[PDB]
DNA sequence: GGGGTGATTGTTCAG
DNA sequence: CTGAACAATCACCCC
């Protein structure tokens, strides 16, 4: 329970850092990237309250393997920023 | 020697 | 604008 699942005002958090790399995207962004268009492309009638919520459920519904593309794309984006972070310190300090 | 924190990321949708 | 559900993350730094 190190990560409380209770609301704590979250959204485009403010700034905090000299260069502030800003970690990396998530397997949900890369996957949601493919879906967003797909999902909504198959349900242009359903709004965010359908495509979104249904996105998450179907997200984990696929399976780790199905995630390989994005999830792996997550480690890819993880390094992407990892560069701006290695410099974040190699420039800020 | 192990812990937990916060910060962030992107979509869609809307008044 | 921005947040809100939806989900993952996980790098960051410490005493």
PDB file of C-alpha atoms (C1' of nucleotides) in Angstrom:
ATOM      1  CA  UNK A   1       0.000   0.000   0.000  1.00  0.00           C
ATOM      2  CA  UNK A   2       2.946   2.297  -0.712  1.00  0.00           C
ATOM      3  CA  UNK A   3       0.899   3.921  -3.475  1.00  0.00           C
ATOM      4  CA  UNK A   4      -2.438   5.211  -2.095  1.00  0.00           C
ATOM      5  CA  UNK A   5      -5.287   4.799  -4.580  1.00  0.00           C
ATOM      6  CA  UNK A   6      -7.080   7.822  -3.126  1.00  0.00           C
ATOM      7  CA  UNK A   7      -7.564  11.152  -4.967  1.00  0.00           C
ATOM      8  CA  UNK A   8      -4.869  13.757  -4.328  1.00  0.00           C
ATOM      9  CA  UNK A   9      -5.414  16.604  -6.791  1.00  0.00           C
ATOM     10  CA  UNK A  10      -3.491  15.453  -9.864  1.00  0.00           C
ATOM     11  CA  UNK A  11      -3.230  17.046 -13.307  1.00  0.00           C
ATOM     12  CA  UNK A  12      -0.449  18.736 -15.276  1.00  0.00           C
ATOM     13  CA  UNK A  13       1.373  19.165 -11.967  1.00  0.00           C
ATOM     14  CA  UNK A  14       3.318  22.419 -11.649  1.00  0.00           C
ATOM     15  CA  UNK A  15       7.062  22.711 -12.240  1.00  0.00           C
ATOM     16  CA  UNK A  16       9.975  21.748  -9.990  1.00  0.00           C
ATOM     17  CA  UNK A  17      13.511  21.390 -11.346  1.00  0.00           C
ATOM     18  CA  UNK A  18      16.322  23.281 -13.145  1.00  0.00           C
ATOM     19  CA  UNK A  19      15.756  21.535 -16.470  1.00  0.00           C
ATOM     20  CA  UNK A  20      12.917  19.297 -15.305  1.00  0.00           C
ATOM     21  CA  UNK A  21      13.117  16.337 -17.725  1.00  0.00           C
ATOM     22  CA  UNK A  22       9.668  15.103 -16.699  1.00  0.00           C
ATOM     23  CA  UNK A  23      10.067  11.323 -16.579  1.00  0.00           C
ATOM     24  CA  UNK A  24       8.640   9.500 -19.598  1.00  0.00           C
ATOM     25  CA  UNK A  25       5.264   8.618 -21.085  1.00  0.00           C
ATOM     26  CA  UNK A  26       3.436   5.453 -20.070  1.00  0.00           C
ATOM     27  CA  UNK A  27       2.373   2.184 -21.683  1.00  0.00           C
ATOM     28  CA  UNK A  28      -1.097   3.701 -21.414  1.00  0.00           C
ATOM     29  CA  UNK A  29      -0.152   6.681 -23.582  1.00  0.00           C
ATOM     30  CA  UNK A  30       1.458   4.647 -26.360  1.00  0.00           C
ATOM     31  CA  UNK A  31      -1.287   2.022 -26.234  1.00  0.00           C
ATOM     32  CA  UNK A  32      -3.976   4.671 -25.787  1.00  0.00           C
ATOM     33  CA  UNK A  33      -2.333   6.312 -28.794  1.00  0.00           C
ATOM     34  CA  UNK A  34      -3.194   3.323 -30.982  1.00  0.00           C
ATOM     35  CA  UNK A  35      -6.610   2.940 -29.360  1.00  0.00           C
ATOM     36  CA  UNK A  36      -7.819   6.541 -29.147  1.00  0.00           C
ATOM     37  CA  UNK A  37      -8.006   6.537 -32.946  1.00  0.00           C
ATOM     38  CA  UNK A  38      -8.975   2.870 -33.215  1.00  0.00           C
ATOM     39  CA  UNK A  39     -11.409   2.738 -30.294  1.00  0.00           C
ATOM     40  CA  UNK A  40     -13.143   5.990 -31.240  1.00  0.00           C
ATOM     41  CA  UNK A  41     -12.824   4.951 -34.884  1.00  0.00           C
ATOM     42  CA  UNK A  42     -15.102   2.004 -34.125  1.00  0.00           C
ATOM     43  CA  UNK A  43     -17.312   3.928 -31.706  1.00  0.00           C
ATOM     44  CA  UNK A  44     -17.478   7.509 -33.065  1.00  0.00           C
ATOM     45  CA  UNK A  45     -20.806   7.735 -31.237  1.00  0.00           C
ATOM     46  CA  UNK A  46     -19.440   6.985 -27.769  1.00  0.00           C
ATOM     47  CA  UNK A  47     -17.850   9.880 -25.881  1.00  0.00           C
ATOM     48  CA  UNK A  48     -14.879  10.008 -23.511  1.00  0.00           C
ATOM     49  CA  UNK A  49     -16.951   8.243 -20.874  1.00  0.00           C
ATOM     50  CA  UNK A  50     -16.980   5.184 -23.114  1.00  0.00           C
ATOM     51  CA  UNK A  51     -13.818   5.244 -25.201  1.00  0.00           C
ATOM     52  CA  UNK A  52     -11.746   6.225 -22.182  1.00  0.00           C
ATOM     53  CA  UNK A  53     -13.047   3.921 -19.460  1.00  0.00           C
ATOM     54  CA  UNK A  54     -13.466   1.136 -22.021  1.00  0.00           C
ATOM     55  CA  UNK A  55      -9.902   1.896 -23.101  1.00  0.00           C
ATOM     56  CA  UNK A  56      -8.462   1.027 -19.709  1.00  0.00           C
ATOM     57  CA  UNK A  57     -10.542  -2.112 -19.220  1.00  0.00           C
ATOM     58  CA  UNK A  58      -9.729  -3.367 -22.715  1.00  0.00           C
ATOM     59  CA  UNK A  59      -6.154  -2.218 -22.137  1.00  0.00           C
ATOM     60  CA  UNK A  60      -5.410  -4.799 -19.460  1.00  0.00           C
ATOM     61  CA  UNK A  61      -7.926  -7.084 -21.165  1.00  0.00           C
ATOM     62  CA  UNK A  62      -5.539  -7.684 -24.067  1.00  0.00           C
ATOM     63  CA  UNK A  63      -2.652  -9.271 -22.152  1.00  0.00           C
ATOM     64  CA  UNK A  64       1.029  -8.526 -21.384  1.00  0.00           C
ATOM     65  CA  UNK A  65       1.954  -9.824 -24.838  1.00  0.00           C
ATOM     66  CA  UNK A  66      -0.555  -7.489 -26.493  1.00  0.00           C
ATOM     67  CA  UNK A  67       1.131  -4.721 -24.504  1.00  0.00           C
ATOM     68  CA  UNK A  68       4.585  -5.666 -25.790  1.00  0.00           C
ATOM     69  CA  UNK A  69       4.127  -3.086 -28.591  1.00  0.00           C
ATOM     70  CA  UNK A  70       3.279  -0.174 -26.303  1.00  0.00           C
ATOM     71  CA  UNK A  71       4.565  -1.331 -22.921  1.00  0.00           C
ATOM     72  CA  UNK A  72       7.848  -1.964 -24.710  1.00  0.00           C
ATOM     73  CA  UNK A  73       7.316   1.395 -26.389  1.00  0.00           C
ATOM     74  CA  UNK A  74       7.117   2.556 -22.778  1.00  0.00           C
ATOM     75  CA  UNK A  75      10.653   1.471 -21.965  1.00  0.00           C
ATOM     76  CA  UNK A  76      11.555   3.107 -25.274  1.00  0.00           C
ATOM     77  CA  UNK A  77      10.047   6.433 -24.217  1.00  0.00           C
ATOM     78  CA  UNK A  78      11.538   5.877 -20.765  1.00  0.00           C
ATOM     79  CA  UNK A  79      15.034   6.152 -22.222  1.00  0.00           C
ATOM     80  CA  UNK A  80      13.889   8.936 -24.543  1.00  0.00           C
ATOM     81  CA  UNK A  81      13.505  11.200 -21.515  1.00  0.00           C
ATOM     82  CA  UNK A  82      16.310   9.360 -19.731  1.00  0.00           C
ATOM     83  CA  UNK A  83      18.472  11.469 -22.036  1.00  0.00           C
ATOM     84  CA  UNK A  84      17.002  14.794 -20.923  1.00  0.00           C
ATOM     85  CA  UNK A  85      17.467  13.516 -17.370  1.00  0.00           C
ATOM     86  CA  UNK A  86      21.092  12.423 -17.701  1.00  0.00           C
ATOM     87  CA  UNK A  87      21.682  15.959 -18.946  1.00  0.00           C
ATOM     88  CA  UNK A  88      19.204  17.442 -16.487  1.00  0.00           C
ATOM     89  CA  UNK A  89      21.963  16.704 -13.987  1.00  0.00           C
ATOM     90  CA  UNK A  90      24.802  16.973 -16.509  1.00  0.00           C
ATOM     91  CA  UNK A  91      23.741  20.589 -17.017  1.00  0.00           C
ATOM     92  CA  UNK A  92      21.838  21.701 -13.919  1.00  0.00           C
ATOM     93  CA  UNK A  93      24.561  20.345 -11.634  1.00  0.00           C
TER      94      UNK A  93
ATOM     95  C1'  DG B   1      20.054  -1.127   3.240  1.00  0.00           C
ATOM     96  C1'  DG B   2      15.470  -0.496   2.042  1.00  0.00           C
ATOM     97  C1'  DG B   3      11.794   2.799   1.487  1.00  0.00           C
ATOM     98  C1'  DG B   4       7.812   5.983  -0.678  1.00  0.00           C
ATOM     99  C1'  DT B   5       7.081  10.265  -3.059  1.00  0.00           C
ATOM    100  C1'  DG B   6       6.150  12.831  -6.076  1.00  0.00           C
ATOM    101  C1'  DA B   7       6.060  13.925 -10.504  1.00  0.00           C
ATOM    102  C1'  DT B   8       4.616  12.982 -15.285  1.00  0.00           C
ATOM    103  C1'  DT B   9       2.347  11.263 -19.532  1.00  0.00           C
ATOM    104  C1'  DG B  10      -1.635  11.014 -23.158  1.00  0.00           C
ATOM    105  C1'  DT B  11      -6.656  10.363 -24.882  1.00  0.00           C
ATOM    106  C1'  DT B  12     -11.179  11.915 -25.245  1.00  0.00           C
ATOM    107  C1'  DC B  13     -14.941  15.368 -23.892  1.00  0.00           C
ATOM    108  C1'  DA B  14     -16.716  19.235 -22.278  1.00  0.00           C
ATOM    109  C1'  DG B  15     -18.350  24.532 -20.515  1.00  0.00           C
TER     110       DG B  15
ATOM    111  C1'  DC C   1      -7.671  25.989 -20.174  1.00  0.00           C
ATOM    112  C1'  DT C   2      -7.956  22.363 -17.523  1.00  0.00           C
ATOM    113  C1'  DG C   3      -9.357  18.776 -15.357  1.00  0.00           C
ATOM    114  C1'  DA C   4     -11.454  14.266 -14.807  1.00  0.00           C
ATOM    115  C1'  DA C   5     -11.508   8.943 -15.383  1.00  0.00           C
ATOM    116  C1'  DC C   6      -8.279   5.384 -17.318  1.00  0.00           C
ATOM    117  C1'  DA C   7      -3.581   3.305 -16.516  1.00  0.00           C
ATOM    118  C1'  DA C   8       1.255   2.750 -15.944  1.00  0.00           C
ATOM    119  C1'  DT C   9       5.771   4.369 -14.380  1.00  0.00           C
ATOM    120  C1'  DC C  10       9.372   4.483 -12.147  1.00  0.00           C
ATOM    121  C1'  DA C  11      13.363   7.753 -11.659  1.00  0.00           C
ATOM    122  C1'  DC C  12      14.277  10.388  -8.144  1.00  0.00           C
ATOM    123  C1'  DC C  13      16.664  10.872  -3.650  1.00  0.00           C
ATOM    124  C1'  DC C  14      17.107  10.096   0.947  1.00  0.00           C
ATOM    125  C1'  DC C  15      18.457   8.826   6.389  1.00  0.00           C
TER     126       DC C  15
END
